[PDB]
Amino acid sequence: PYLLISTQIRMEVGPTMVGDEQSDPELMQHLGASKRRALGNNFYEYYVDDPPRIVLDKLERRGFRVLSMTGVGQTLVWCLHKE
Amino acid sequence: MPYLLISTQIRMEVGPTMVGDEQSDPELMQHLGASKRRALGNNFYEYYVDDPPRIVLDKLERRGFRVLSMTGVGQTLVWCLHKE
Amino acid sequence: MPYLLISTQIRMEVGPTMVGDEQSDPELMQHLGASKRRALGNNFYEYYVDDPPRIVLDKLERRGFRVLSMTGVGQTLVWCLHK
Amino acid sequence: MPYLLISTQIRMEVGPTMVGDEQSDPELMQHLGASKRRALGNNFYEYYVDDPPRIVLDKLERRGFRVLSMTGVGQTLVWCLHKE
Amino acid sequence: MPYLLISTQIRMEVGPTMVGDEQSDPELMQHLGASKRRALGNNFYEYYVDDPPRIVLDKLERRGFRVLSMTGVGQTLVWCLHKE
Amino acid sequence: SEEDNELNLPNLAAAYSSILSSLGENPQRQGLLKTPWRAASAMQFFTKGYQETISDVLNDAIFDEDHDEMVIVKDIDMFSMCEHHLVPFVGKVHIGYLPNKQVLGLSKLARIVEIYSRRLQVQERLTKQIAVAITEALRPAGVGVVVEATHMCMVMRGVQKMNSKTVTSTMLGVFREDPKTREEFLTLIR
Amino acid sequence: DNELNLPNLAAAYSSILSSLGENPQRQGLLKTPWRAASAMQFFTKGYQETISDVLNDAIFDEDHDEMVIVKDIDMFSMCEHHLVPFVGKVHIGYLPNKQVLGLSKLARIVEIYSRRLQVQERLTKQIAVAITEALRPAGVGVVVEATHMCMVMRGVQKMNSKTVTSTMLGVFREDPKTREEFLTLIR
Amino acid sequence: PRSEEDNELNLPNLAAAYSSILSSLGENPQRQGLLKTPWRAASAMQFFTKGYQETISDVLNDAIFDEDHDEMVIVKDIDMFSMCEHHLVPFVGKVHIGYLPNKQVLGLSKLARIVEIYSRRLQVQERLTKQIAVAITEALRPAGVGVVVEATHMCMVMRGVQKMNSKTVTSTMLGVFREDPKTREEFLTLIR
Amino acid sequence: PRSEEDNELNLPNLAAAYSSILSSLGENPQRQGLLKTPWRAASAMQFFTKGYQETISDVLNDAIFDEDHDEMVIVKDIDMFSMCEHHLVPFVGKVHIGYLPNKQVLGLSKLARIVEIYSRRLQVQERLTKQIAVAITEALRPAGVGVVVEATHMCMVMRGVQKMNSKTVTSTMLGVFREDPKTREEFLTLIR
Amino acid sequence: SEEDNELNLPNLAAAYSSILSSLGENPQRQGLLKTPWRAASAMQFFTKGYQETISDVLNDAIFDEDHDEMVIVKDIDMFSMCEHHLVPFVGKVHIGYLPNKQVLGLSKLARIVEIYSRRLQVQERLTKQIAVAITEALRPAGVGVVVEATHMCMVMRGVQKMNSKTVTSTMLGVFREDPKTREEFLTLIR
Amino acid sequence: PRSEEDNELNLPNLAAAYSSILSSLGENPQRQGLLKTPWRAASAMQFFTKGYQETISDVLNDAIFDDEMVIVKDIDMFSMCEHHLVPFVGKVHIGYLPNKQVLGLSKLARIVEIYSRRLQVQERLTKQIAVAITEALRPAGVGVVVEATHMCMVMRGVQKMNSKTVTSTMLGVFREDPKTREEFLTLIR
Amino acid sequence: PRSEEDNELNLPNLAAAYSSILSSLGENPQRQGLLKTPWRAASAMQFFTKGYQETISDVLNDAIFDHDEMVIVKDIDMFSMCEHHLVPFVGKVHIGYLPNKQVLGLSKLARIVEIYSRRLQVQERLTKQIAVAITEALRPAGVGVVVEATHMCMVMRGVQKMNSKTVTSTMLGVFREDPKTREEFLTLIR
Ligand SMILES: Nc1nc2c(ccn2[C@@H]2O[C@H](COP(=O)(O)OP(=O)(O)OP(=O)(O)O)[C@@H](O)[C@H]2O)c(=O)[nH]1
Ligand SMILES: Nc1nc2c(ccn2[C@@H]2O[C@H](COP(=O)(O)OP(=O)(O)OP(=O)(O)O)[C@@H](O)[C@H]2O)c(=O)[nH]1
Ligand SMILES: Nc1nc2c(ccn2[C@@H]2O[C@H](COP(=O)(O)OP(=O)(O)OP(=O)(O)O)[C@@H](O)[C@H]2O)c(=O)[nH]1
Ligand SMILES: Nc1nc2c(ccn2[C@@H]2O[C@H](COP(=O)(O)OP(=O)(O)OP(=O)(O)O)[C@@H](O)[C@H]2O)c(=O)[nH]1
Ligand SMILES: Nc1nc2c(ccn2[C@@H]2O[C@H](COP(=O)(O)OP(=O)(O)OP(=O)(O)O)[C@@H](O)[C@H]2O)c(=O)[nH]1
Ligand SMILES: Nc1nc2c(ccn2[C@@H]2O[C@H](COP(=O)(O)OP(=O)(O)OP(=O)(O)O)[C@@H](O)[C@H]2O)c(=O)[nH]1
Ligand SMILES: Nc1nc2c(ccn2[C@@H]2O[C@H](COP(=O)(O)OP(=O)(O)OP(=O)(O)O)[C@@H](O)[C@H]2O)c(=O)[nH]1
Ligand SMILES: N[C@@H](Cc1ccccc1)C(=O)O
Ligand SMILES: N[C@@H](Cc1ccccc1)C(=O)O
Ligand SMILES: N[C@@H](Cc1ccccc1)C(=O)O
Ligand SMILES: N[C@@H](Cc1ccccc1)C(=O)O
Ligand SMILES: N[C@@H](Cc1ccccc1)C(=O)O
Ligand SMILES: [Zn+2]
Ligand SMILES: [Zn+2]
Ligand SMILES: [Zn+2]
Ligand SMILES: [Zn+2]
Ligand SMILES: [Zn+2]
Ligand SMILES: [Zn+2]
Ligand SMILES: [Zn+2]
């Protein structure tokens, strides 16, 4: 039911992080997400080139609703829930 | 287009207020009196208004949007609105 | 005028509390006991009260306002109210 | 007095938790087991408890308060509660 | 025990996720597969899991918890949950 | 062009000879006989940046390295001419950028400084032109430029503030949007 | 390979002496083709090394996670575009994940990549990647500061110019607080 | 803990081993300059490892004072001399210590004495750095402790890699010095 | 507060104690170089502890101006000479003071005179640092005060641990200097 | 000559391409494609002193003055090439002289450093050639030349003494004969 | 010379005098921070004047060996002014020209410790170090330079915070031959 | 002279002696951090005394070329071992000489420092050995050697004088007889 999405530095432009190693593969495919591991990181991530506003509209069509939005460092995070 | 992101920097009482990106609804941007620009070195266009964010929020309520969340990140104050 | 933005700096237990901008409702500013000022070098006027934010929130509830969101940005704590 | 502001610094799992200001409800401060102090150089009094914030939140629910918002500002984690 | 505080540092996609303090529900900590530790110099014990926070949030929904608020503070991302 | 330089050299020498007479000096004395020509050639060299284009200066020195890390060329000696008084302003340029898969040849950053500094200028314009030229040539994630200079018009004359220095800064792309990238750049140029 | 290629390098250096207008038979130049060839092989000795041999199993357990830095490591490399030296210092920082590297190995890793025909950016990245793969730490930060002689002795001739390159991996990239502690401690 | 009686008993064994080293290096232990070396080298090595003879309790010597003091205390530029355990060659430098008291304040000199207990041993920089921080944490129970050790390892300068300017910097941040970046930043600013 | 009459009355008792110290060290109080030493050492010790003769109110001398300045004021590099209460040996260095006035601005020199009241006593660095900050806070009621003391303790260099380069840095941050990290950062940047 | 440079450039490039292969490198990789030509041009620039003569460098910049006082041009950046290893040696040259009737143009003292330093050299010879060129061109009462240099052959290889510096000194005419003149020179170049 | 038995017998007298000084200054010797001060101040004063317990012969130990300049410079020195009983601290730079006897390097610093750890005047201290080396080694010459900050001139009295006293003693060839003295002064910079 | 065969034959004896030292100090030679220490300490000690494996003739390697100038190689990093305590003494060596028809290869002056410093020594002997070796190899008009070193035996133990430095000087030939030559040398090594 829970989803975490994020963007860095500016909210108007991507990349947008949309998942982790254990994310729903069908949802990642639906968003057009690619999988990568940044150098030195102990984890894989899914990302899209789209700005977060576009990702939020796509997720609403999948039954997700934004519960909370927060800034942490230079990262803007949205916590969504499939209600 | 149900989601909207708006923002202001440094002080909340004064504009400019960022109200959109390249793929924003052009009619909504025109309604807000927004101008389009690309800051030097940036890989994207943005829409902005001279109005402080409180004025933009009142105008957006008259278009069916409600504030879902408000957050600070760096020196930017962001509002996430939803058309409901 | 359904939306209101209020704020305090450095500590939440003490004022001043910023309660408005140049285009704020003059009657609401008078009701809160707010004064108008322009800090040196600023391109805008602001309304403020000496009261801590908890007192201002209680006064605004009696005027029909409800807190929708509260956030920190730099050393400023902001409340977004709606009526 | 419908609104309440509580906070903790540096880590969320341990106190002290700030639970009030000079004009806070004295009965509620006594119920929480709060002490009153003034940190050196400060122009205000504060109420605090040794309990971590999770314990304070549970005690406040038993008094009719509900968390409306939680935010970070600097090294302070703040909760805004409302008696509803 | 209606309130719960969970957190992660530096990146949201990977653990550890902090899920409790010394007075947390031992059954809930055991259910999450949490370990107890005291970081050097700290005056408190904490419970943590290796899972990323998204996994912990899904497990907590199955226990009756709902996210009320999410916030960043320093390099820590915090969720405040409530058993409603 | 170099043809313009040859054609304008006698006009510059005539103007410098006229300046020598108008100052009360004797253009015929030994020490001043070649001065109209030497001053004219020096002024042409100080303004040689007008003869250059970014394309020629770059000379295809753009490489492909999978670099997404900060690159800095600091302490680049800079010599410019104040456009208000025709007196030098000299100092250092510190340049930083975050590549976007195109990496510029290290020396080309200093050559870009030479195009704009060898002109009649103002520090603010010079600083901005260096940052904009790198941005347009490489299309990077961001560019930061810091110029520190002593203006001889503020030390040899006018206000005569012997220690005064002007520092100008231009931050584009991620160097403006991300304070962490700007802070890493300012820490590394110390 | 070095022994077999030494006469070919000496023949090329002797040819360079003649092509510059010099006399390879003059006293001061007689041994120059051989000495220049040996110097060039020493400057490119990093191609003879592998990370595994250089590490020499000098990886030890350190349970407490503290920042470890080896700074001011003198570095001497060769520009691949002009075959002229670029020299300076390397500052390395890392946050261990239960494994700590032998102090000297951080400088030996600098030697593997610096003693090659290079570009500063690639050199900086290679040092950070080698440490990341050998130790699997929480993160690594590498800062290289160098004077390229191609920018001072010729070309632009900017006497004081210096190139600074930075590579931040793992927590050194993701956590600005870790990167700031590293940059503060290398001053 | 090593005793002064242990030192007297082991001194002839250390001198015999150093005399053997002189012969194995090709030197003449009978020449004037080397006659007393087996004994002088043995005594120097016992002094370099005198930290094994000490306890935190004896070193503290009850120099813990009480105070309504909740402000940062730093003792910086403490000269430190240690022995690398891998090569038995010195590593030398400075130790900078900071702490935020919790009603108990350590005697200023004791912070340097704690550096002496651990540095005068066969060590590794990382272990030395955590031992100083852990000793202060356990003795005072403060809000936090920060320790920075900067050292020149002679094994990296006189031999091996031979990087003349190389320096090792190790840092340990405990309690509020780890949890609060603002406390750590004040500490790092004040030790410059 | 100690008076000039107390000083005159106690001077012979101090001189008798210093003469006794000369004899107890094995020295000859009758030799030319030591004849006046009991009196000079007694006068020097009274001067080193002259801060006991002063009060904040007299030292301030009504040098409080009502100019509404809302900007940072710093007096740095104030030479400080104090006396360690535990060993009666000097500790010397510098004091750096910063404050954000509210409605009252203190006279520049009084910040250095406040350093003199507390430093010219038998002290401990921590207490001295706190006393300077508390005196400024109570005298002006500003938005906040920051005080940094850096000192060499002769008890750690001439004796004991004998760490020649060691320095103690103590910090006290009150009001906005504690609550606002941005104010504290501006202060620490400007005192470098 | 510049004609010699054009004719020999392909031969130098062929030798540098051969060096790339003999070192185990791939001359076809992107970073090395133009290296044979760039290395050849850099080596010709490092040895451009062979294209110059003292007479052309002086350019008749000898003035007649009633100056019989000490003239020094110090901290002249110098970049040379060791003739034994073909590796740079770099540093500073400090020149002093006591004019008799002729005073040399200030910049020519630095140009004289350039004629001899831009060659395959040994520091001692370089030092002597600068002093002798000034002595023969001006016939002064005396000349003093001090060259301080870091040899990269002693830093990057061989003995690898990172801080080592070579200082050579040539004192001619009154700079040798009168210790008071040499002491004034050495005091003024600090 | 002062002995360890003399130290045990005189340590209570020093402590009693410091307790009396605490009372005479207006302080309370019974307050927590001052309880141990009479003993600590006494021990510190014995340590500052431990040089009276030492002789040149004991210090010379096994450190004399059987014609080039030898210098030990930047020797940290901590002494006590005999006029005010307040420290004067700085550096000692020693140079000598051997005559068939060379001294152990460390002993030059130990010689500084014998005379500096006493109640002194800079001039006497400087001369005593030069004379001790001259008599122990019989060299061609000795040069001694002392640079010190006197706390009696900076914490009180004239209060000249930058003032420094430099004293010099040149014996044998260091006095007779200006070329030897000039080489010494150049090499100690 | 010591050889690599003597080194390999004596390595187990050195390791046995270092293992014995670990036990005699109260340490545990079986703990992880000390397991290879007897061998690593033994190898380090034979590297610190590698000077016994060398001779002046091999080190010079015929690098003697066929001047009227002072030649100086200063700031040569020096690492030696005190023979009395077997503890390092480290610093710098500054060498100057006036050639007499024979000039020594620059690096050999640093190689000569290596032969004598890589031994159990006393500073005075080391200083004299360097000056005598140059004197005998070149037969110059004179040689001057200045060694400045921190003895760890005076800082880490004993007197514990943190800032103490030993400076030793040897002046031979004209460097002793002519004060003007010695003064030029001392001025140029600053
Ligand atoms: N922002 C900017 N300004 C620049 C330069 C270069 C020069 N200038 C400034 O032009 C102004 C001209 O003023 P003016 O007409 O009054 O001249 P004049 O009486 O001679 O002045 P003064 O010098 O005071 O004697 C001066 O203020 C000078 O500083 C630059 O790079 N950036
Ligand atoms: N990013 C990067 N670039 C590097 C090196 C080493 C060298 N280079 C750069 O290659 C470019 C080659 O250009 P080119 O073909 O035009 O040559 P040439 O006419 O001789 O140039 P120039 O020297 O300007 O006269 C130069 O820009 C040089 O700086 C490095 O480490 N990192
Ligand atoms: N982390 C840490 N590491 C330390 C010390 C002290 C020493 N060491 C390191 O032990 C490693 C041993 O490796 P090894 O067996 O291959 O030895 P050896 O061939 O002689 O090496 P080298 O010196 O390269 O010639 C080296 O890397 C050395 O630096 C410390 O404090 N912290
Ligand atoms: N916090 C604080 N501490 C201070 C001073 C001034 C002094 N002190 C410290 O009192 C302690 C007394 O201990 P003690 O009884 O064991 O004495 P003693 O054997 O002579 O010690 P030592 O010097 O090690 O030989 C010492 O640690 C000394 O440093 C200050 O300003 N702040
Ligand atoms: N006087 C003088 N000497 C000069 C130069 C330039 C170089 N040289 C010196 O010729 C010597 C050649 O010896 P060699 O054959 O043994 O070579 P090689 O094994 O590579 O040596 P090394 O470096 O020790 O490894 C070296 O000593 C070198 O320093 C100069 O300007 N002045
Ligand atoms: N030559 C020499 N002189 C020395 C010392 C140590 C101290 N002194 C000097 O004895 C004088 C004492 O004078 P007095 O009686 O008048 O004392 P007092 O009023 O307290 O003096 P003051 O300090 O001026 O206030 C002072 O001049 C002091 O400097 C030394 O090493 N060498
Ligand atoms: N001239 C000269 N002297 C040298 C060295 C190297 C060392 N030495 C000196 O031999 C002396 C031996 O004396 P000793 O037996 O009493 O030793 P020990 O009790 O351990 O001494 P200490 O250090 O005081 O504790 C010391 O004085 C030492 O400094 C050198 O290069 N030149
Ligand atoms: N490291 C992120 C902050 C962050 C912390 C926790 C979770 C997610 C993000 C930044 O600096 O932008
Ligand atoms: N770059 C913004 C923060 C931000 C991050 C992510 C999204 C939006 C804004 C600032 O520094 O103010
Ligand atoms: N400038 C504010 C932050 C802020 C940004 C945007 C809007 C409002 C406030 C501070 O530093 O406290
Ligand atoms: N001063 C707080 C931040 C804060 C600002 C405003 C209100 C409450 C708290 C901190 O640095 O942690
Ligand atoms: N100390 C945390 C911030 C924090 C403050 C308060 C509560 C929880 C977390 C950090 O720097 O990441
Ligand atoms: Zn101008
Ligand atoms: Zn190049
Ligand atoms: Zn080692
Ligand atoms: Zn003390
Ligand atoms: Zn060479
Ligand atoms: Zn005195
Ligand atoms: Zn020794």
Residue numbers in the entry:
A (entry chain b): 2 to 84
B (entry chain c), D (entry chain e), E (entry chain a): 1 to 84
C (entry chain d): 1 to 83
F (entry chain C), J (entry chain I): 60 to 249
G (entry chain B): 63 to 249
H (entry chain A), I (entry chain E): 58 to 249
K (entry chain F): 58 to 123, 127 to 249
L (entry chain J): 58 to 123, 126 to 249
Give verbatim lines from the article.
Complex formation with GFRP-Phe leads to increased activity at lower substrate concentrations and eliminates substrate cooperativity. R216 is part of this region and, in substrate analog complexed states, coordinates the β- and γ-phosphate of GTP variants and contributes to the charge compensation of the triphosphate moiety. Concerning GCH1 stimulation by GFRP, from enzyme kinetics, we know that GFRP-Phe merely reduces the positive cooperativity of GCH1 and, as a result, slightly stimulates the enzyme’s activity in the presence of subsaturating concentrations of GTP without an effect on Vmax. GFRP seems to help stabilize the active conformation in each of the 10 individual active sites of GCH1, thereby reducing the cooperativity between the active sites and allowing for independent binding of substrate.
